[PDB]
Design a protein around this nucleic acid. Structure first.
Lengths: 305, 108, 333, 293
RNA sequence: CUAAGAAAUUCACGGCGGGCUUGAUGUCCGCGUCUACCUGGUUCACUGCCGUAUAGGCAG
């Protein structure tokens, strides 16, 4: 949640076969926890070598193409699966269901380290994209360019220094290259707002999101209930349901040197916005943050308002 | 403020994936549309004209958009005597002021 | 009684479109075949000298505007450079029957209005109004811009019954003033004709021909045409002049404006020039509306208070009410 | 109290287009009927204007009609702003006539600035000026254009008699109509400079000509009342006085000498400028244009 | 260090026969579009050229 010095831009990341289930309840665009864990994998691989801190991440999503189809007569939309290799006996394979969606996102970043003072600006942007080409974002591949070679280069804005005029004209240069998309933030306060509004009854927090994934055709005191934006359900994070184990006392772990808790998912609210709406683009970043004492493991866009 | 940016969404989608944009198919009242939602082409294409090399103040299509925003509201006769349309004229004015400055750097 | 929801009066004193042609002075007695003034185009480059924008006082923004001039395509209409006279010719036709509307909902309100107008006509004819319309034929009011700055302006009016001039008139439009309506033994010969036309006693068709010496190759001023968007400044985006069959012409309603400028009555002008007879009596160039609706001199106020409520206006204002029925209009609701 | 939103000023000193025709020098006696100058081509396709090679003298002829009544706007919203504007000009005209203006207008007809690129490079330029009350000439004139200085203005009893005529026209004392005829030795078959169409040449009866407004630009270089420097000569009287060829302007709105700033002082704010600065104020009312808000 | 990490739905098919959409109709009436302007910012960085060779009475 530290204020970023620079803003590294990954220009147009075409994503093949990303995940689209994203929670037990909210199908669609993949989880923002996938993006916050992606930047921590770049900080794992690159940011310790360039001595920089890659923490925040923005989500732009220029194009979303899911692999869905509605059947004949229904209105709900089912998923497209894939075959698997056969069994040991070669009879057939069991069916697991995995959502699948092509995707074209752009990723703002936040940089804190002293490598800005050592390496030049192009050296920062070159080492990241050459690493991020051979990686995976949402369980799917990342594709290169062909046949017009326009959107290939990166950008970087040292938004730590300069007068407020020098930021604001330079800030309008990123919003050019982020314009066909729709920026994504979390609105944790509107869900707190409408629970206190709906106190004629005694509802729940989960009963409010069903009144925000809505077409509430209201009868006249006919009419359709208005929306102040493109409000949408997102997974907010995780919530532990188990005590915190020793690293070597849970069977079939990934590795036997880190502790474990069994968690749930945790549902919140998100709004999709145009990039020219938001004044400061540093408010757009997603920061994972967690207190390990209790069971919270969440992520959000802080400082947004 | 939605419509000020929805046109920008409409601008960039028409800008992207159309490099072969030109004026020759079907032009009757489409003035300065070659000037605002142009293909940048990494080059200029002009023979008997100098305007295509650069661009300054593409605001008349924004004024025509502002003339559409007066046409966007359908009919309200009781709003003229009240200062609500005067407030709406300020709503028309404070959003074009953001709209012109955004529209500069595509040609400035 | 109540007013009809739709009243539609067909207009009287119905003019035509005036062509323009030029020739030499003293050939105006044989101005049968003068060549017409042809609209021609030219290229105009001018600097930016307009009212300055708010909070825009930057001297380099002034100097950068010098680097971007105004290349601009207009059309003009000059005389032939040997000629000096402007022959303007149109035909005014007087119809008559100003009381009867075309469309009218209430049959009772129609019959009350016809008795109201016939009360006016039998008490006093149209000769008061026809005294005033004859002056706007006498002085060259329909020469709007062209009359200003002329040596001599001469107006000839012919009454044609068959295809033959029944009586001619010969007027000096500069000796006759532009503001005052003086009587004459020659104007009343033409005023009795128009009063007979408006009353419906006969047929009146007038051929109005106005000569005006201007100078060798100077500029005439036809009516100006509305322009649609066709692209950049090249393409006559600035100015387009009205022309029919390649002759620079004036709109009929501009001449129809210049005939009915007879209303010397006002709220608050003694002798400051007549206004055109309008409901909510206004001048577009002056911008102000005389004869306001909160004032009781309004046409819609005077008419409704004389046909419904049945009190007469001033005779000073009764000549105003009938003149709004001669020009016609979409009256009623 | 304030300027009206609409201020349209009908212009005065209205010129015409200028026909061009060739002819031999010292043939000024029978100089009425000449062959004119056409617009031909040479090859890549351009349009050039040249004399017939047997002749040496360009003949330029236009007419000028002095209208007068310079105070009254043609279109004005408020009458109180209209009346005091007429009161302010009536303050000006009663204090001094149009003579000092018209004496500077009397130069631009004599030393032929309307020969824009034709006077520079010439060697003998003679301008005829005739006053025509009727078809006959009621008053004639005869003026050398090279002896009268292009950059410096000087007076003459012939010029001042001509200045009182244009002063009589602008003050509305009567009718003034002028026939300006300019003979200029350029040489045999030389390139005259007509006005440049937006590239053909402006011809009318297939006879190459100059625009009317391009002559009226030459008849209003009177403003020597600069903010900066009179050393460059006179410049055409315009609000925000600026020259396209020099590129820079003069008379900035940051300066307090702006025509709009002067007019608000001289009419609304009742703040009189200098008498030398009053001549700049009136000479834009003769120019005319859309003023006000 | 990413609801992390992995995955072939395939093969084949006749859409086809038939059809009356008719009848009748008043679009009326009224209007001011004005005001100013330098295209001398080269219509081929050129129209003829000794050798494309900054070679010219170059026609400048």
């Amino acid at each position: 949640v530290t204020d970023p010095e620079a803003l590294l831009l990954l220009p147009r990341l075409s994503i093949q076969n990303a995940n689209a289930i994203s929670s037990p309840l909210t199908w669609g665009f993949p989880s923002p926890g996938a993006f916050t864990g992606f930047v921590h994998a770049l900080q794992r691989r690159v940011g310790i070598s360039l001595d920089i801190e890659l923490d925040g991440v923005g989500i732009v999503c220029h194009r979303f193409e899911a692999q869905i189809s509605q059947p004949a007569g229904k209105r709900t939309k089912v998923f497209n699966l894939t075959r698997n290799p056969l069994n040991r006996d070669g009879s057939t394979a069991a069916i697991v269901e995995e959502g699948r969606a092509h995707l074209e996102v752009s990723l703002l970043l936040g940089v804190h380290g002293d490598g800005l003072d050592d390496h030049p600006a192009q050296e920062i942007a070159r080492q990241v994209q050459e690493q991020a080409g051979a990686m995976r974002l949402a369980g799917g591949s990342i594709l290169p360019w062909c046949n017009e070679r326009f959107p290939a280069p990166n950008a970087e804005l040292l938004m730590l220094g300069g007068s407020d005029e020098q930021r604001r004209k330079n800030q309008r240069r990123l919003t050019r290259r982020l314009l066909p998309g729709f920026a994504l933030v979390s609105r944790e306060a509107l869900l707190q707002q409408h629970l206190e509004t709906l106190r004629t009854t005694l509802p729940e927090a989960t009963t409010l999101d069903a009144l925000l994934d809505l077409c509430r055709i209201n009868f006249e005191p006919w009419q359709v209930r208005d929306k102040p934006g493109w409000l949408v359900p997102i997974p907010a994070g995780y919530n532990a349901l188990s005590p915190l184990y020793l690293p070597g006392e849970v069977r079939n772990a990934r590795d036997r040197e880190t502790p474990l808790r069994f968690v749930e998912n945790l549902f919140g609210l998100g709004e999709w916005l145009s990039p020219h709406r938001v004044a400061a683009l540093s408010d757009l970043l997603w920061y994972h943050h967690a207190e390990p004492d209790k069971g919270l493991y969440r992520w959000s866009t802080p400082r947004f308002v | 403020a939605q419509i000020c940016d929805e046109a920008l969404q409409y601008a960039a989608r028409l800008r992207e994936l159309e490099p072969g944009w030109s004026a020759t198919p079907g032009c009757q009242l489409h003035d300065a549309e070659q000037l605002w939602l142009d293909p940048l082409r990494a080059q200029t294409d002009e023979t008997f004209l100098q305007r295509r090399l650069r661009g300054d103040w593409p605001a008349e299509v924004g004024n025509r958009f502002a003339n559409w925003l007066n046409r966007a509201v359908s009919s309200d006769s009781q709003i003229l005597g009240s200062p609500e349309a005067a407030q709406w004229s300020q709503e028309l004015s404070k959003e074009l002021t953001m709209f012109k400055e955004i529209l500069e750097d595509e040609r400035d | 009684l109540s007013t009809a929801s739709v009243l539609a009066f067909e207009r009287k004193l119905d003019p035509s479109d005036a062509l323009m042609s030029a020739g030499a002075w003293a050939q105006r007695d044989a101005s049968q075949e003068w060549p017409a003034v042809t609209v021609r185009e030219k290229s105009v480059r001018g600097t930016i000298s307009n009212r300055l924008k708010t909070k825009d006082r930057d001297p380099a923004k002034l100097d950068a505007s010098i680097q971007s001039p105004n290349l601009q395509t207009v059309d003009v209409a000059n005389l032939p450079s040997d000629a000096d006279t402007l022959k303007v010719r149109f035909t005014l036709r007087v119809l008559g029957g100003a009381g009867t509307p075309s469309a009218c909902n209430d049959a009772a309100y129609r019959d009350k209005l016809l008795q109201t107008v016939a009360t006016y006509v039998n008490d006093q004819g149209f000769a008061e109004l026809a005294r005033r319309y004859a002056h706007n034929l006498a002085n060259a009011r329909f020469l709007w811009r062209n009359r200003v700055g002329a040596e001599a302006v001469e107006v000839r009016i012919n009454h044609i019954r068959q295809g033959e001039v029944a009586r001619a008139w010969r007027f000096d439009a500069l000796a006759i003033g532009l503001r005052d309506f003086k009587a004459d033994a020659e104007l009343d010969a033409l005023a009795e004709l128009i009063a007979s036309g408006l009353s419906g006693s006969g047929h009146v068709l007038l051929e109005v021909v106005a000569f005006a010496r201007i100078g060798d190759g100077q500029e005439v001023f036809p009516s100006q045409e509305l322009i649609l968007d066709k692209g950049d400044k090249k393409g006559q985006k600035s100015k387009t002049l009205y022309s029919v069959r390649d002759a620079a012409a004036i709109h009929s309603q501009k001449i129809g404006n210049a005939l009915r400028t007879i209303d010397t009555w006002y709220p608050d002008e003694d002798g400051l020039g007549p206004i055109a007879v309008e409901p909510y009596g206004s001048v577009t160039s002056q911008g102000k509306a005389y004869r306001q609706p909160k004032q009781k001199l309004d046409f819609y106020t005077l008419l409704d208070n004389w046909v419904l409520r049945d009190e007469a206006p001033a005779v000073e204002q009764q000549h105003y009410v009938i003149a709004n029925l001669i020009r016609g209009g979409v009256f009623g609701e």
